[PDB]
Amino acid sequence: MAISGVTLEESVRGAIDDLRMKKSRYVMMCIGADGKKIEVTEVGERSVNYTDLKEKFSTEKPCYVAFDFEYNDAGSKREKLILIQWIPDTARPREKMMYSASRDALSSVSEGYLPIQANDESGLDAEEIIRKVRLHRSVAAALE
Known part of the structure; x- marks a missing residue:
């Protein structure tokens, strides 16, 4: 970590782009070791659901998980893209600090995403x- 002028590149933007219309379902994103730029590391389609992302839980993996979260609201199934940032107390300092801090910049490219942090499997747990998305509905109901 030297150049912490974290830049957002095209693959990141493209990943957001495909997830926005659900060509994909989840996009796990990472930041370079230098803190130089945010980058996509693994992406998956609608086959990856809540159970799958939880079995993919590795508390020491660099992560941001842009995931299309479908939930119940007023009896209707709504779809809200959520942007997870793993801030695990078991991860490497970079993953804890840089990922929490640089989520701000990613929020500009992540249209429609609600920033949600996961420290433990519980923060990645659908339930x-x-x-928390229910709580966020006060604002999430609108495009902000």
Whole structure:
């Protein structure tokens, strides 16, 4: 970590682009070791659901998870893209600090995403996510 002038590049933007219309379902994103730029590391389509992302839980993996979260609202299934940032107390300092801080910049390219942090599997757990998305609905109901 030297050049912390974290830049957002095209593959990142493209990943957001494909997820925005659900060509994909999740985009796990990472930042270079230098903190130089945010980059996509792994991407998956609609086959990857809540159960799958939880079995993919590795508390020491560099992460941001842009995921299309479908949930219940008023009896209707709504779709809200959520932007997860793993800030794990078990991860490497860079992953904890840089990923939490640089989420701000990613929020500009991530249209429609609600910033949600995961420290533990529980923050990546759909059931808690539903609950916090329920809370976010006060603003999430609008495009902001």
